[PDB]
Amino acid sequence: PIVQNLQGQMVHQCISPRTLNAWVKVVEEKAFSPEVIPMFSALSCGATPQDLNTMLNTVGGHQAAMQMLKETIDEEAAEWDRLHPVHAGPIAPGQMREPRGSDIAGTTSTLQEQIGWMTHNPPIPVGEIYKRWIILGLNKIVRMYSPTSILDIRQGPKEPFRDYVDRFYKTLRAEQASQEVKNAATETLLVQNANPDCKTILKALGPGATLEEMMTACQ
Amino acid sequence: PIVQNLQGQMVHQCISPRTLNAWVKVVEEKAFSPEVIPMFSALSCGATPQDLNTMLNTVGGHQAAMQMLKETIDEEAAEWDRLHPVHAGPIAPGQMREPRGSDIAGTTSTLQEQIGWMTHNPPIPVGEIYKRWIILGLNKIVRMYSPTSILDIRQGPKEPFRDYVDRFYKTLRAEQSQEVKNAATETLLVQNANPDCKTILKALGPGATLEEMMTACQG
Amino acid sequence: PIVQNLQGQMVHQCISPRTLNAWVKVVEEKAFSPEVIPMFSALSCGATPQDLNTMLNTVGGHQAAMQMLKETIDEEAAEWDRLHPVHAGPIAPGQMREPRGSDIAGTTSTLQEQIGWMTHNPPIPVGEIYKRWIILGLNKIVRMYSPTSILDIRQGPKEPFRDYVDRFYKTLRAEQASQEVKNAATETLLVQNANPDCKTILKALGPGATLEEMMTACQ
Amino acid sequence: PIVQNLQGQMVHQCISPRTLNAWVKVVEEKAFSPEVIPMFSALSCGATPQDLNTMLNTVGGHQAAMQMLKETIDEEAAEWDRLHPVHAGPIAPGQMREPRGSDIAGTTSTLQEQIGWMTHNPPIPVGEIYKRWIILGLNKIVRMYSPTSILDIRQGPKEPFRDYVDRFYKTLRAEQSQEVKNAATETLLVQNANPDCKTILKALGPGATLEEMMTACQG
Amino acid sequence: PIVQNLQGQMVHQCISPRTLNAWVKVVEEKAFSPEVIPMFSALSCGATPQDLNTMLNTVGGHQAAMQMLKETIDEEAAEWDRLHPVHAGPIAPGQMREPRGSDIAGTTSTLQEQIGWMTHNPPIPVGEIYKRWIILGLNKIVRMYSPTSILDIRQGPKEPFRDYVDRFYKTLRAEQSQEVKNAATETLLVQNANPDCKTILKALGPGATLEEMMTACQG
Amino acid sequence: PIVQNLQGQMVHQCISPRTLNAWVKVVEEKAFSPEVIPMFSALSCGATPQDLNTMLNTVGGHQAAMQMLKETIDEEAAEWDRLHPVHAGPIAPGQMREPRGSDIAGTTSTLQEQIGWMTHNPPIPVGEIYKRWIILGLNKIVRMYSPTSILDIRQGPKEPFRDYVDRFYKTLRAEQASQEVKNAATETLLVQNANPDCKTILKALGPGATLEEMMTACQ
């Protein structure tokens, strides 16, 4: 990663063994459950493109997912290059070449060029741009590896309301879109797919009931 | 988090893999037992709103509770917005715009703006405001997910007094101000002791410490 | 905690995850065995009142003991306030208000006021004063949760002398008073409650025998 | 390793016990699965040749592979020596002699000469040259120790498409440029799908993403 | 402990949770095997008397040994006091009073006075004096708690010579100067070998190394 | 160990608990397998003689090996003293006495004298000299505790060539001499002790076949 020293300079630091192990283990145990995204973002804080490639390369298995990840990165790299055409010309003494999509992804850039971009003034944060592409890709994998659709979450006749809301939002969280789309899913399904006893109780509460009030009413 | 370095400057640091793992593990093993609140507050020392969102997003399961958490944040955010009316105007070079409710929660603010506020002179502790909203929300979850009421905690005829007082205060801590929690001790606590110990505790008279009550019902 | 930076200034540091886990685990495994006191004192090195409250709040179970702890803190807080009456008046630019008992315990003080007291010149060590109250309380719990009295430690007819001295001093250590009181207990009971074979051997050694000599003589 | 301290100077540091243990454990559990290469590269960040030799020497077993590693280092070292003819002459007070192939591998160079080269102005990154030779050698071991060929990876008649693509790319990663690895996807991958999914994938037509192919053979 | 920081100043640091845990665990698993002494000396590097008392107080069980430890400290403390007669007089602003025996053990000295002595110019290493008394006491415990005498360690008729020499020196290390420990080797070691190996070792003659003796009784 | 601070000064640091545990555990699990040597060298990076004695003293068991280690150290100490006769005379204000063999081994030197030697300008690296003696001794133990001779490594009639080369070089690695002696062992035995099928294949390859080519030919 790139961290600040006590001189105020952004300097390269080696990825720690603890960081490597934490990412390998979380994929091993949690696969592509939705909480893999925040874990990857936090463990990759300040990462260079080399570090991000290191983390993803240490993943054993799920190679189908990892190949989908490269294809996502490619489309975003192609989009970056079409929005940022590089201008030919000698690079000045105190300057860095402009990065391509392949440079952000680390396939045509050295770690020293990545450090130069990320510690420039102003910085060009190729690590954070790459991370955005990867997380975009990981969001697709989470949505694809989600077993259940939101339309199949129906409260059982003896199922506690808390367990049903647990399943509802767990399923909704794996299908990542905008929250405009997830507020619409709740208003459409959460009360309507409650069991007949709890459904009649919540209809009387009205659309303005908070979830805390809804969960108290079907206790 | 934003911590002070070895020279006296407030700097951003990445959340450590140990901090991430410790919070995930505590929710896994302890759910929303009352001791989850101090663990979250301590593990989030100096956290930015991004860090707090990271910690909350790494929680697997309990998505109904986490959704109640979201609803609580909204009410407090709306209260914050109603107490801090917006002032339109260009933000000056040196200073920073005033944060809205959605900015404290980190949903409409970048990490650099959160760092900018916290290292301002004087600091606007958006991380601590967000943390307070979260703990307010987590406190509600502990109360809702508490299985037993304090009025149902009563000492068995052969149960040692220590075990009953253990159950009593464990339940009371889950049942959340001291206006009536102070009230449960010494008035409900004696009433639900078994007849053998209850007769002993009348003889002790008012003003007995819990150490005196526990000594008196040892045998 | 409050630690020194390289500038010579006492600055606040976040309580580490390792410190939190160590205290939670030691209570889990050792309950209120006497070695819980030194572990708590060492793990709370440099703690603020907030940190001390954090540690105690993370304890799961033993809520009867924890309530006895608050009552001890209250008496010591009441004693502090009666020995340190606060003098009303505006606090000067370069000064701190005088702390109440409730301020030392952290119920009416912010963490910033605790930092101000502890890093003042000269410092008013509210964290170390609070720690003294807590450890005073923990000493009472260890004495109360001790199963055996010193008068019941008698050497068995086939029990090795080392095992008996182990039990003797383990029991004596849980009943914490002054060592004047513990030297008196040894001179009163250690030889007199030895088995008849070892007792006659040690009587000949006389009162001036070291324990190493006593343990060698009954090998 | 040679890392930058908190002030901006490149200093030698001892390899940490965690780094040593992490590398030993990864070889123990993963042998020469493809993900061993990124783990070794990351754990050896900033390594001197002595550090790289330390890591390789701590490997227990797989001594045939480790001997193949030695032979690879020799060929690259001999290539290095053939591209860098020796210049005889007294080495000047300030500067350092040119490193031979055996010097990069650390067999004829002391640790202080390796530090001297790496902190030179400009640096001669002997640690990174050695690391590159090692990874070149480790890449050969992964290919030789890969049990299955990509031409033998074919989808079963009842095997889910995700599991087959998982096996496909796991094998391809073990079978080492993208000149023909790009070729295996989309041409060999469709051919070895089962007849049910194979018929579906013809209908998708050329240019289908892997996400589209995996969605189309879900059911 | 008192350690040197990154700038060259001797500063007090809190004993780490890992140091506390490591010492507790080593006593739990190894008791007073001889290797407990080096572990305690190394884990207490730079310790203050308070730190040494902390480590000793965290030991659970073995309270008879710990009491023998207390008696040893008293004898050495009394010897220290007899060699350092007290000088009455007001202590000067800059300097510190001379420490008594009870001050080195930390029972009548505060932690700040122990820090003051150790950072004095020249230092009075009260922590190292206390540590030496403790190790003197712990050495006695290892001898008393050693089950077997070196005179009872003899090679079996079918026991491999390596295993017998292993038992021999393990016992000798437990049986504590080299005045007669040097004596046990080469004179008692040959005498207690079995007749087959014993006959071989006479033929080797005086001056054989242990490597030569172990090679000669391999078969 | 002796590490560099940020002032550029070589200063003493306490041996870490992690370093102590790592060395104890690696001996426990791996005994004197050849990889114990690099682990000991890396874990003892920058060690003083006191630290090296600490590490070796923490080893439980294998006391026969540890006694052979002292005898090796003695011969090397005697050789050092006969090559470096000390010159009598008062030591100057800014100087250190010359170290004996017993001073390098730490039996007649204080830790402060070891720090003085190791941080002198120029340094006299008693820690690295001692380490050379210890590793010389550990090499002898590895050779002695090796069960199998290189002449007994013969490929089985159904044994895969990789497994045979594994055994061959594992055995050769435990008998440490020069690589001139180990190149001679390979050319003498590796092909000649292959099974008749693989032997005839490799004879046709000729003496110039790399191991990678040899292992491919007997797949």
Ligand SMILES: CC(C)(C#Cc1ccc(-c2ccc(Cl)c3c(NS(C)(=O)=O)nn(CC(F)(F)F)c23)c([C@H](Cc2cc(F)cc(F)c2)NC(=O)Cn2nc(C(F)(F)F)c3c2C(F)(F)[C@@H]2C[C@H]32)n1)S(C)(=O)=O
């Ligand atoms: C990527 C990254 C940089 C980031 C970020 C990031 C940024 C902001 C916010 C956030 C914070 C507070 C509020 Cl009040 C809202 C809001 N208020 S709202 C009602 O929509 O209008 N919205 N947000 C997101 C916004 F603004 F982006 F929309 C938020 C989140 C929350 C964090 C959070 C998690 C939690 F458990 C409980 C909380 F109180 C807050 N995370 C999510 O909400 C994800 N989630 N999704 C759904 C579902 F789909 F089921 F509905 C569900 C969640 C859920 F909250 F977990 C919970 C079960 C429900 N994260 S990171 C740190 O991962 O690296």
Ligand SMILES: CC(C)(C#Cc1ccc(-c2ccc(Cl)c3c(NS(C)(=O)=O)nn(CC(F)(F)F)c23)c([C@H](Cc2cc(F)cc(F)c2)NC(=O)Cn2nc(C(F)(F)F)c3c2C(F)(F)[C@@H]2C[C@H]32)n1)S(C)(=O)=O
């Ligand atoms: C989490 C966080 C945000 C914080 C904080 C926080 C802040 C202040 C205080 C506190 C300090 C001193 C006093 Cl004298 C009182 C007081 N005296 S009184 C008579 O009420 O007026 N009260 N308090 C709480 C105050 F201030 F909130 F009111 C306090 C606590 C105590 C600390 C504590 C914990 C403990 F285990 C044992 C102790 F001896 C002291 N913790 C609690 O009390 C929690 N608790 N709750 C209840 C219940 F409700 F069931 F009865 C019960 C407890 C209990 F004490 F454990 C015990 C069984 C009874 N913690 S943090 C720093 O980790 O981030």
Ligand SMILES: CC(C)(C#Cc1ccc(-c2ccc(Cl)c3c(NS(C)(=O)=O)nn(CC(F)(F)F)c23)c([C@H](Cc2cc(F)cc(F)c2)NC(=O)Cn2nc(C(F)(F)F)c3c2C(F)(F)[C@@H]2C[C@H]32)n1)S(C)(=O)=O
């Ligand atoms: C003590 C210390 C300070 C050091 C060092 C140290 C210094 C240099 C080198 C080294 C590096 C590269 C080459 Cl190309 C040669 C070479 N080329 S060669 C063909 O001989 O001409 N030689 N060397 C040693 C030289 F120069 F000293 F001879 C080397 C080693 C190798 C490290 C290594 C290990 C490995 F697994 C694979 C590698 F690619 C490199 N370690 C050894 O080789 C030990 N070993 N022994 C034998 C056997 F006996 F079976 F043959 C075998 C090995 C083996 F390699 F493991 C492998 C199975 C074969 N270590 S430390 C770090 O431990 O603290």
Ligand SMILES: CC(C)(C#Cc1ccc(-c2ccc(Cl)c3c(NS(C)(=O)=O)nn(CC(F)(F)F)c23)c([C@H](Cc2cc(F)cc(F)c2)NC(=O)Cn2nc(C(F)(F)F)c3c2C(F)(F)[C@@H]2C[C@H]32)n1)S(C)(=O)=O
């Ligand atoms: C180890 C180290 C030295 C390094 C590096 C390193 C360097 C660059 C790149 C890389 C980055 C971006 C793109 Cl867009 C491409 C590209 N796009 S493409 C169409 O080929 O032209 N290719 N690459 C590799 C390049 F550059 F080498 F060609 C890349 C990688 C990727 C990172 C990655 C890993 C991952 F898991 C999932 C991802 F989405 C991305 N890792 C690999 O690709 C390894 N891999 N191999 C094959 C195989 F051969 F089987 F098909 C397969 C992979 C796979 F991706 F995992 C996936 C199943 C397919 N890593 S390090 C920094 O740790 O020390």
Ligand SMILES: CC(C)(C#Cc1ccc(-c2ccc(Cl)c3c(NS(C)(=O)=O)nn(CC(F)(F)F)c23)c([C@H](Cc2cc(F)cc(F)c2)NC(=O)Cn2nc(C(F)(F)F)c3c2C(F)(F)[C@@H]2C[C@H]32)n1)S(C)(=O)=O
């Ligand atoms: C709270 C805190 C800040 C502190 C401190 C603290 C301060 C000083 C001392 C101490 C040191 C040396 C001597 Cl010679 C005496 C002494 N000489 S004497 C004979 O009395 O005249 N006295 N002391 C205490 C003094 F001075 F306070 F009295 C001491 C202790 C000892 C530490 C110790 C433990 C140990 F195992 C072996 C040792 F050699 C020293 N701890 C105790 O002794 C507690 N203990 N109690 C009893 C019993 F009740 F059974 F008798 C028993 C012990 C016991 F020692 F463990 C052992 C089985 C016997 N600790 S902390 C670090 O916990 O956070």
Ligand SMILES: CC(C)(C#Cc1ccc(-c2ccc(Cl)c3c(NS(C)(=O)=O)nn(CC(F)(F)F)c23)c([C@H](Cc2cc(F)cc(F)c2)NC(=O)Cn2nc(C(F)(F)F)c3c2C(F)(F)[C@@H]2C[C@H]32)n1)S(C)(=O)=O
């Ligand atoms: C704990 C601490 C305070 C310290 C220190 C400490 C200080 C010095 C020395 C030492 C160093 C060099 C020599 Cl050449 C001799 C010597 N040569 S000699 C012929 O006697 O004259 N003697 N010594 C001890 C000295 F100086 F004390 F005399 C030494 C040791 C050795 C180091 C060592 C350990 C080891 F495992 C293997 C080694 F090769 C060397 N450790 C011991 O010897 C302990 N030991 N005891 C006996 C017994 F009594 F059973 F025979 C036995 C050992 C043994 F060696 F292990 C082996 C089976 C025999 N350690 S610390 C720094 O951790 O805080």
Ligand SMILES: [Cl-]
């Ligand atoms: Cl780490």
Ligand SMILES: [Cl-]
């Ligand atoms: Cl790790």
Ligand SMILES: [Cl-]
């Ligand atoms: Cl996996």
Ligand SMILES: [Cl-]
């Ligand atoms: Cl890269």
Ligand SMILES: [Cl-]
């Ligand atoms: Cl790659």
Ligand SMILES: [Cl-]
């Ligand atoms: Cl893989």
Ligand SMILES: [Cl-]
């Ligand atoms: Cl960490």
Ligand SMILES: [Cl-]
């Ligand atoms: Cl971790």
Ligand SMILES: [Cl-]
């Ligand atoms: Cl955010």
Ligand SMILES: [Cl-]
């Ligand atoms: Cl989100």
